[PDB]
Amino acid sequence: SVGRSNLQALAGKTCGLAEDVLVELDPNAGMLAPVTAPLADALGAGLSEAFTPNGIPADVGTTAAPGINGSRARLPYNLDPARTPVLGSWRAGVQVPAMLRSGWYRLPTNEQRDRAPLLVVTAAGRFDSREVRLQWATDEQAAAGHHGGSMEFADVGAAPAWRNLRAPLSAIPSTATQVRLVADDQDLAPQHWIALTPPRIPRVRTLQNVVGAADPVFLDWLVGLAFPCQRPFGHQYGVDETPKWRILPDRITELLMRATTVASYLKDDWFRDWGALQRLTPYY
Amino acid sequence: SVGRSNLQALAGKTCGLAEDVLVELDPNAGMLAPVTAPLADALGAGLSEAFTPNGIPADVGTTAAPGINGSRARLPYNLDPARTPVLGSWRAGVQVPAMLRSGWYRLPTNEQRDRAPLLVVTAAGRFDSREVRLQWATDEQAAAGHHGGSMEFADVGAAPAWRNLRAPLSAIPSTATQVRLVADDQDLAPQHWIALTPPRIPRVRTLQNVVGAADPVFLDWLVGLAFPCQRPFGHQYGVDETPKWRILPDRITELLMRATTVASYLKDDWFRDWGALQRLTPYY
Ligand SMILES: CCCCCCCCO[C@H]1O[C@H](CO)[C@@H](O)[C@@H]1O
Ligand SMILES: CCCCCCCCO[C@H]1O[C@H](CO)[C@@H](O)[C@@H]1O
Ligand SMILES: [Ca+2]
Ligand SMILES: [Ca+2]
């Protein structure tokens, strides 16, 4: 019944699943502005206890030059290190309690058509949903150091790798004007740690609009059934060209390409790990 | 256009792709009877030059007890070693020219409904399509040591791993009564070698008939779209059960199970590597 409706829904769309996957090519464009603190400072401006810019294992790799707040952690989803502070509670050796409270970030008032209805935080590590929360506040509450309420995130994707935590904007009261992140890592097992980046509201376009019908896409035959309008990379008729994307199921390779997963969300279920879209670029 | 028709075709089937994947659970049931030689002897009864039962790398692993002709190579697709001779041209150290000509095998005269229209050989290694051929003959030709003609196989699947070579039965003349395998491995590069097992005509049932709608199946959400009638393994409503199958795209994991790929073929394109069906059993 569910299976049957899913498939009927799929076939009823001109370009199948490509119309339902929403792609966020520029996660930095959606970042919330800090209320008072400079961008570099805002992520840890409230409190940081044993959360540091390099508190993340090399293997969740590492960049030569540090990002804005000193992190050499390689960031996912084409997050720009020069515009993306990172704080994490991982460390080698002696494990200690760790906590984070960011400064306040401003929620949008200016409407934008191309936004997903989600507050998103790119995060890594292993943690329970209660350990990372989004607090909200009015101007008055924030000024007095209080918050009006809080929510948890849906943790979507495989841990401890980088992934996008999602919180439906619908849960945030309409009078809230500011939000902040709070994290609590009291679990001293070495494998239990948290890394966060600042909050954003994704600006998105459909995968069909982003990928189109001309860019060649690496994908399994099975997976391609759901993406009828995408051009499958192959060599029929002696075709020779450069693949530009790869689509993967949720759970290189001919030509030495770098594959970068781009942030994406399924319109039909914002908490579903649908699979992955990756942009391919010459490894050079 | 192709994409669109594929997807419309998919959705038009009650159980989607499950009706088009044909599964061969018992490859030994389809094995051709040798004309004159005992089963153990027939695979190398004509000529074997540097083709041996253990001429296959451990990593294409290995079994404790040898199979019928002395091979400790672990066989794929639930081939029964006690009924499946193997001969291969791989070796360490000094590389030598290698050739194989099997004895004659009898083509069926008794009709069977559940057969795929293919002559199949399970093979491993790296080789060109010209290096492995199927020869056919009438009784008269075979008796005189001649053959009436020959064909190549479609090599479907990733090399050098085990896979199923396929030759359409339609290509074999109606007067042919016997077939044999011939292989030529003159390439002395160590990575270039061939391993073969005897010819068969697969007995098959649809994946829908084999897997059904009750056995839980491990599969990616994306892949499941094409298999609407299969029960996806998960824990919704606190469901606790043992997964029995896994379906994979063409290009563990929660509970310590052994995964065994079963032989399968896509009815719509016998040369397409559609993906894989695996049977799961307790690793114990
Ligand atoms: C079983 C149908 C075989 C048709 C011939 C090759 C079909 C290729 O099929 C692939 O390409 C399509 C996208 O255009 C997509 O539906 C599928 O993954
Ligand atoms: C976007 C639709 C979300 C519906 C709620 C969960 C859907 C689960 O979807 C999975 O199960 C189906 C097989 O029954 C198959 O179509 C799909 O892979
Ligand atoms: Ca910890
Ligand atoms: Ca060789």
Numbering used by the authors:
A (entry chain A), B (entry chain A): 735 to 794, 825 to 1015, 1035 to 1067
From the publication, what sentences describe this entry?
As a first step towards the complete structural characterisation of the Emb Araf-transferases in M. tuberculosis, we have determined the crystal structure of the hydrophilic C-terminal domain of EmbC, the enzyme responsible for arabinan chain elongation in LAM synthesis and a target for the front line antibiotic EMB. The Emb enzymes of M. tuberculosis display a common architecture of 13 transmembrane helices in conjunction with a hydrophilic C-terminal domain, and share the same polyprenyl donor-substrate, β-D-arabinofuranosyl-1-monophosphoryldecaprenol (DPA). We found that the architecture of this domain comprises two subdomains, one of which folds as a lectin- or CBM-like domain, the other one shows weak similarity to the C-terminal hydrophilic domain of an unrelated GT-C glycosyltransferase, oligosaccharyl transferase STT3. The presence of a CBM-like subdomain in EmbCCT is consistent the proposed role of the C-terminal domain in acceptor substrate recognition.
EmbCCT crystallised in space group P6522 over a diverse range of reservoir conditions, with one molecule in the crystallographic asymmetric unit. EmbCCT is composed of two distinct subdomains, separated by a deep crevice marked by the disordered loops (residues 795–824 and 1016–1037). A high-density peak (14σ, anomalous density difference map) is embedded between loops S3–S4 and S10–S11. Quasi-octahedral coordination geometry and the distribution of peak-ligand distances from 2.40 to 2.63 Å suggest a bound Ca2+ ion. Soaking EmbCCT crystals in cryoprotectant solution containing 27 mM Ara(1→5)Ara-O-C8 (∼3-fold excess of ligand relative to protein concentration in the crystal) reproducibly resulted in defined ligand density, allowing us to unequivocally build one Araf unit and the octyl chain of Ara(1→5)Ara-O-C8, while the second Araf ring remained invisible, even when contouring the map at near-noise level. The soaked di-arabinofuranoside ligand is positioned between two symmetry-related copies of EmbCCT, forming non-covalent contacts only with residues in subdomain I, but not with the CBM-like subdomain II, in contrast to our expectation. The Araf moiety packs against helix H6 and the H6-S13 loop, forming three direct H-bond contacts with protein: O2 binds to carbonyl O of Trp985 (2.53 Å), O1 to Nε1 of Trp985 (2.99 Å), and O3 to Nδ2 of Asn740′ (primed residues indicating the symmetry mate). In contrast, the octyl chain binds between helix H0 and the S13–S14 loop of the symmetry mate. Ligand binding promotes ordering of the N-terminus of helix H0, where 3 additional residues become visible compared to apo, and induces a conformational shift of aspartate residues 1051 and 1052 in the S13–S14 loop. While this crystallographic complex structure did not reveal binding to the CBM-like subdomain II, it is possible that crystal lattice formation of EmbCCT interferes with binding at a site on subdomain II.
